[model samples]
Target: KNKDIRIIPLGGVGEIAKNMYIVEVDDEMFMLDAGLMFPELGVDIVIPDIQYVIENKERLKGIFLTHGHEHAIGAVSYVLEQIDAPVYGSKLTIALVKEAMKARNIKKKVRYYTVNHDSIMRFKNVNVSFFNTTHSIPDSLGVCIHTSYGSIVYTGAFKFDQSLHGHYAPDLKRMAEIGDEGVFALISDSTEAEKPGYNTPENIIEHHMYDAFAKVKGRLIVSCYASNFVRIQQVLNIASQLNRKVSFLGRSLESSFNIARKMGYFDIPKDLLIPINEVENYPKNEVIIIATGMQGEPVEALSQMARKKHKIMNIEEGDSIFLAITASANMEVIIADTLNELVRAGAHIIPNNKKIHASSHGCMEELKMMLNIMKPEYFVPVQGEFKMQIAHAKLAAETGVAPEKIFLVEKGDVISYNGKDMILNEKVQSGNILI
Candidate 1:
């Protein structure tokens, strides 16, 4: 009998988001990361092309998540609509995924299993295991697929920073053990391959926050990504240290953390958190406003306040606003305009490019670390632009992996192995589907 092995990426190759991948062996297929991406303009969110998934829904065993970031879990609600499959992840990951499903009115009862560093699951001939990694969010794990060829490791968005605090800690012991078990191929994230050295950890953000918070004599508004629960906890801790009451603005910012708190992912005293309506009731110096719109999203609260069109709060002179996020595409200009509007309103703005924000992706040095540890017969780069993937392929070559063994694959590209050798056979249904 001839068995087959194939790796298919429906999205997230040659792009920054909408990451989805399929691993197939014989009759069973398992998916990794059902995420969504953002367009330059005129679209809400873009999802993966799931026509192939719909056709082969019967063969899919499960969908596993690396983390809860929108880029990793944003399309869960959309994907679950077309096909129903068991979903597995860490506690916080499944919480956020189920929450997203609830928001979309998805009443389908999909089986959700919570797994951690020690859990090993089997789906027919494929064995799935996870190793913890540090990112901007908690419970992020890199997956290892045990296959007939060898262990195929997928290093989801990761950063190796020993200085990281809270729930962001990488499991180096497990990583080394997985390395000892021979690896067939390695799929790694390349978002920060151009940047030389390790990424700044979550603790470094405290310094920036402390310095900025000390200068504010009035209401301090913080704009950040809702999925960045680690940063949110940091800001809340800073507010607690400063004796300020915290209030969350925007539905997403409020809802995500509230659920996080209940799930024990983010811990904050009830007294510290107040309703958005109560922000004005407290003294300006006693309140800290946490809001959405680090991306300069027009509908979020911070953007409305920047435009002076907000219903609840307006920027006051001497107030400090810190954007704990970076930008992409035209959102950079939109973020700049929002900062200018805040500056025009006499509020102090801490730019997104500052150290106040930390990227979740690992840098080039860490990428080299991953390559050295998980030495594989073949290396494939994913989760970045084409140029980044090219740079990563070069880095892999430098790490002593053979030049021909390094494959830079994109969406719809399928690489298959027949026990002895590998080849790019054909295309699958892979492209951006604007939602």
Candidate 2:
């Protein structure tokens, strides 16, 4: 009998979001991510179909989170409800997962372990090593799973951010080392692979955001992903420097701030941050509110405002709104219409009617740097749409990767390494189970 590897994508292929994947060696199994999907049109939040795993729960050795992003961790809570397994991540990531578990009143600790910028762990016979990767999230790692068959790497959503707070970029030297060690398959993120060029840097947003905030005399409201505590760092620093009070305006935003602040993860002046309840008392111009909902998430403060759900929060002219998160192409119509509503209600839009808002993922240059370093036997671009994946794969090939080796995977496709090469094994059921 030929021993081999089996891979299944629960979601995040032909479509973007709700990323889940399972790796199986014979009967033993491990999961890469367990996260949820944002529902639109009355759709329920989605997660991996647990039926298969539930049937073989014990073989599901453990789950290794690629990063702490919701697309990677959101479904875990749901999974926990159905199955009991230990989950591992970076320090902050484990803290985040613990917090999420507490929400369901799960007294039993949904087992948590921490991996670092470079660390090693073992599951059965699989040798797993983590390579530090730069992303909007801190402590994000690219896992190199070493199996008897070969070495496979999952480049969690990444960018080349030499200026990241820690001044981290994907450890190219290390990735190169892994390649030398021998890579049979590289299950890279295919979303952004299509993007031509390299990953974008994180600091690029500071230039534009600083310019907008410096000139604006009124309140500056920046919306972003709730999980992006670091970007909130940038916003808070700016607001504090400008003598503006920082306020968090939604449930998640508020809760996350409380957690991060108490942990002393920020340089935020205690004086600079005021609770949302006190928001009404402050003069509008003296406030800088960092909230969520850049992607039309229904619960984010901005989304609530658009829906008239937040009785205390109101939008008015002279206020500046930075939709820091851009909506996906499919969400353009609704988000565009929402932006029009915000404009009509009287607010200046950053990334404005013409400019693009801030996103911290890798752009063309960053992507190129990654290719030069990892130089893997295979490449699968992740973190962007079809165009992004195409552009990235093209950029990788143009920069030197064998075009045939850089695979472009869709939302539901199973990507596996043939004994000799990497190919789309097949299409499997993939989607999210929302929390």
Candidate 3:
């Protein structure tokens, strides 16, 4: 008989953004992706209630971060204030988390470790392997746990992108090797499962945008998330090719992109990328502007531009805008706000009428490709609005997983594996979306 491994999800269910999970074997418990959720309009920071972990803090070894995205890394900074446990992930993940550590004035007791995708780390009697995966962000991983029952696979947030600007994706060959050993349970991202075809990679959008830039008659404004270097690089490539001076806006956007460029992570031409402070000097038609705030972030450059805050970035009826961010999750009101702002700014809305943003996930073909590669016993969907989760579940069923074997659980539901089979054992509250 094998020992029972109890699994409890603290977040990434009920909602799509914040993700955290805990696995227990014998007497000790360990956590993964201890992250925070983004707060909505006029709300306090949303954090999963960690009451369960607080009560069992001593038994909790540490938190495993799957990647560097805000949804996966935000709350750990808050967690560090409560516990002195170490945070572990790959090199880029560790580096990105440090930004959070610095933000809250943390005194530096938190330890961040760089683990290879296939490296296994032991906590008490449990072992976990984090595999590289393609995500909208860099250093994403699909977490796998080796237990007496077998293996539990969680494809953190993945997509099919061979030409990923991040230059990494799930090591499917290695995962196939692990899957051959038999995967006990599987939880995967469902964000893009609803999309019919394969999720387009970064290269396509960059090429499309570059081609668009070549034909645009007026100034081209590219907007996207501040951390999306891969997409940003595409814009820069297009801008440089057009012999257009590249100018940036938004403090957060500038700092992050500049950091990436200065660190040699982004191969941008020094003369091409200019500061927003120098924006007025450049000829408007010969300039390409990239800014942030597509998510209705009030103070974002997009919103500011809408408010006519940037006198130099004035938009005319003939101006072209390329907003490169996905629609914010559950922020219907902000879609109006975002659209209204851009409309007022004479910015062409790509998301509204055209497909400008490239998602980092597999569509039907890609999901089928992945399923064929590593067919696991149990399938669970993570990372989506509840609808996306359900859609992924249905997709799994279509892929031949029985309906009864599929487990759809909210954050904090625990499943205990009893060697022969796994069953839901207990549940614990860790945190909520809004704190």
Candidate 4:
């Protein structure tokens, strides 16, 4: 008889952020992700309550990262502080994690191993492998844990877009192979379960951005999330083609740009990048400023520019500011205020709704497609709110998954799978810890 495998979500269930999951097969435990959440005012960030993990530290073998987004790898430093587990991720993800740790001034010598799509790690009773998936960031991956009974597939935040190729492409053949190997359970992302049809592809945004950039009569100010490397790359390509000299603004934007450039994720020409101070040396129409604060943070570069308080650049008349970001929850008011401020400064603001921004997560059809491809016996919807998870569960049922086998669970819930069947087990210690 095979030992029971337990799936425990410490966070990233019932809510959108702070993604952490524990997969325990026999005595060994593997952590899928250690992400953090952006909380309300006064809190810097929120991490999962790791008391359960701390109590079973000896059983923890390793921590595997899915991507480099804040909701995927943000709490790594905090987790490494308590446990001595080696971290495994793709090259860019590891680089971003190292940069984040350095910025936090963590002196701990953490071991980070870079893995590709074909890399596999074997333990005493389990084997782990990765498959490529397309997200907002390059080098995103989905994990598969091969156990005695069957394989458990964890599809990180992903969307299937035929337009994406190379590193940003999803491995559909690999996913079908994992299904053929008999997946006991599938833990899938439900972030876009409510949205219908496929997500807007990145190529669509590229065309929109090019049109916006070509029409700019003065300096072009582009605002995006610091971690969205794919969008950054598109912006860089467009700027290069338009013969625009680019300068990055904001602390995180500059750092991420430097890291991505050094890691070969960006291919902009040498002459395209100029120091922030040299922006005035070039004509306004030939300069592009890629900045952060698309979310309207008070201190980020975009907001500072809108308020005319930025040390390097300020919004002036005829300047076109393209906000390449969509507002998340609790950000509408702040984003509106920032837009108002930019308008007051006489800058033309191109809003996100002009087909300039696309979500990284898959929609309902993509979710169904993933379910059909994996064809797992059991399903657990993760990385969304309760409503979204329920919607995902219904989609799974529609895709031939048994209703009873679909586990719409929240954080702290334990789901155990014996060799014969799967059932709900006792709960564990789980919640958020404000940092």
Candidate 5:
């Protein structure tokens, strides 16, 4: 008989962010995705409970990061202080974490490994592999932990876009191979499980972007998340084709994209790119402005432009503004107010809808597809709110993951997996700690 393998979700069960999890095998413990959540009110940031982790610091082997996104790796530096463990991630993920480490003036000896799909790291009695997976960002990976009983696969924020330009899409063949090797448990993303249809193809976004860009008679202002290098690449290519000079608007927008270009994830050419000051010199019709503020943050470029407070650029009459971003539920009011201000200033709005900014998490069809591919015995939904997790659980059951095998778990739930089956033994110390 195999010694029980323990799975504990510290966060990202009932809520969307702070996606932390723990895997204990034989006496060694490893953490997955030490993420942080944004605050809506007075708090600076929120993170998963570190108390239990700290108490078991002696057993900790290391920390594994899924990707570079804020929700997956943001709380790592904070947690690193209390515990000493090597961090493992891809190049971009480690770079972002290092940036955070520098900002916090953390001088602790940071031991990290820049891993990829081919890299495998072993600790104590377990071996970990980073499998190729795709998301909005570049260099994303799904983590697989090989234990004594069976392998556990955690699909961290994945999407299957089988398009020609699906840049770094998930390796379906390798994923299937992993499944064939016998997966004991699978914790998958449920961020868009309630959403209908398949994940939007990159070609669809390209088609829509081209059609919108062709209709712009004046300056074209595209607003989206700075970290969305996929969209940024599409926008840059479109801008170049339109014979328009592309100029980045927000500092964060400029910085993140510039770093991506340097890292070879983005391919912005010097001929098509123009400096921020030069955007004012060019004719409005010959320029394309790309900035931030998908969620109407006050400091972002689009918000500043909407408020007529930007130092270099202002919303002008006839300017075509494409708010090419997925508007969040909480920021609807502010985003609406910002759009109204732009409209009041006589700028032409490109109409806001989910389809216009279609890059999103995998929907219901994709969720079903993931289940069919992995075919794990046990299913636990992660990286979504309560409703999304419940919806995902239902979908898993519908796809032959027996209803009894599906666990609609909350943070801190302790699941013990033996060689042949799983059982809920008890709960652990888990809660959201404000940072």
Candidate 6:
């Protein structure tokens, strides 16, 4: 009997968001991630069409999440609205997904199984396992599926930082073990493939943040993505060390902090945290306010403060503001406007630079390192644009992957391996479903 394995990317290729991928072995299908994207202005969110998955829902055994990031898990509630399958992820990822579902008023009793690096699930002809990978969020995992052909490894967004310890460190031993077991094809992240050298370590960002915090003589305001718990934790640590009372602003920021705290992802002294109402009780020189809207969203806490519309607090003179996030595309105008408003308010803004913020994605050397470590026969780069994927393919070639084995595919393209060789098979119905 001959066995054929199919790998299909419904989304997360040729673009940076709405990442969803499908793997089929024998009669079973498994989904890698169900994510959402913010296309442009006026669009609430965009999810993968998922028409093919709906057609083959019966074969889908489970949905595995890599992490809790919006681009990786934002569409879980939407996908559950269409199909029912058990969701598998780490404890933190599961908690975040449940929070998402609750926020959407999803009353369905969804089965969520929290797994770790040691957990393995077996099916009729396929076995699934996970390995830890370091990223911006905690409990990030890379999926490995074992079939008759060999192992297919899907590395979620990752970077290798030697300075990290504990859960934030990548599991190099487990990765090497999997590679020695033989990886048939490696599907990896390409978000930073165009850049050279490794990603800036998180510890470096912490040092920079500490220096900035030490220099602030008045109240300090820091803003970043709410879901970035690692970055938020850094702020908390810095505030504690500087003997500053910390207050969280923005609904998402507060909710994320609470959830992370409940899940034991954050460790801070209780006395260090204060409610927004109590911020005024502390001396201006000993207060740190963590907020959202580093991208200049009009309604977020930082933006509202900038526009002088926030009911809780306003940007006052002698306030030191740090925008700890990089601006995404289409956000330049609003960000510039917010900067001007902040300047007009007599608040000094921290200079946005690489030293203060580090990217979670691995760059050229890291990508090359991943390729060299996995040493798979085939490679497919996911989670980036066409140029990024092409650059990743070239890096794979330099790491000894054959040109023919490297696939530069778009969303919905199906690549199949028939025991002997792998080839592009057929295209599936795939596009964006704008909400």
Predicted candidate 5, C-alpha RMSD:
3.0
What TM-score does candidate 1 reach?
0.92
Candidate 2, residues 1-435: lDDT per residue as tens digits? 226576666666544566666777666788888766666455546666766678778898888887777778877777877778888888767877777777556776567778875678866667789888877767788888887655777777776656675624467778888877776556665454444454344466665667788888788877777777667878887887778898876665665556666766667676888876897788888898776643324334565575556666767677888776645654566667767777777778765433443445665665666666656666676545667677767776777778887777665666665466556768755444444
Q: Model 1 Cα displacement at 107 (Å)?
A: 1.5
RMSD of candidate 4 to the truth, in angstroms, is: 2.6
Clashes of each: 0, 45, 10, 0, 0, 0
Which residue pairs in candidate 3 collide?
9-412, 36-75, 46-433, 46-434, 48-431, 48-432, 49-430, 49-431, 49-432, 50-430
Put down candidate 1 lDDT per residue, 38-119, tens digits, no spaces. 5554777788988888899999998999998888888888888888898889998998887777777788878899999999
Residue 83 of model 2 has an lDDT of 79
Q: Write the per-residue lDDT of candidate 6 for residues 1-435, one digit (tens) a residue.
A: 229788899888877777898999978999998888755446767889999999999999999999988778989999999999999998988988888788778999899999899999988878899999988887899999987666899998888888777778888999998888899899999988888888778888888889888999999998776777778889889998999989887765676678888778888887999998999888899999888643212235566798788877889987999876544443455677778888999999987565333777888999998898899989999988888899999999999998999998888899988787788979999998988
Q: After superposition, how far is residue 147 of candidate 1 from its true place, in Å?
A: 1.0
CA deviation > 4 Å runs, candidate 6: 39-41, 293-301, 309-314, 327-341, 344-346, 353-357
Give the per-residue lDDT digits (tens) of candidate 3, residues 53-166.
888888877678877666677688877777778788877677767755664567766777788775888776768887777776666777787776667777776777777634
lDDT of each: 0.81, 0.68, 0.70, 0.85, 0.79, 0.84
Off by over 4 Å in 2: 167-170, 190-200, 293-300, 352-357, 399-406, 416-427, 432-435
Candidate order by decreasing lDDT: 4, 6, 1, 5, 3, 2
Mind sharing the TM-score for model 5? 0.89
- Candidate 5 lDDT over 1-435, as tens digits, reads 247688899988877778998988868898989987655345667888878889889999989998877678879998998898999998888887887787678999999989988888877777998787878887888888887656788988877787733346787888888888887789899988888887668888788888888988999888876667777888888988888889887665665665666777877666998888888788888998887643212325665787778877777778888875554343456677788888888889886446642744678888888889888888888888789899999889988998888887788888887666678879888887876
TM-score of each: 0.92, 0.89, 0.89, 0.91, 0.89, 0.92
- Model 3: residues with Cα > 4 Å off, grouped in runs: 293-301, 309-318, 351-357, 430-435
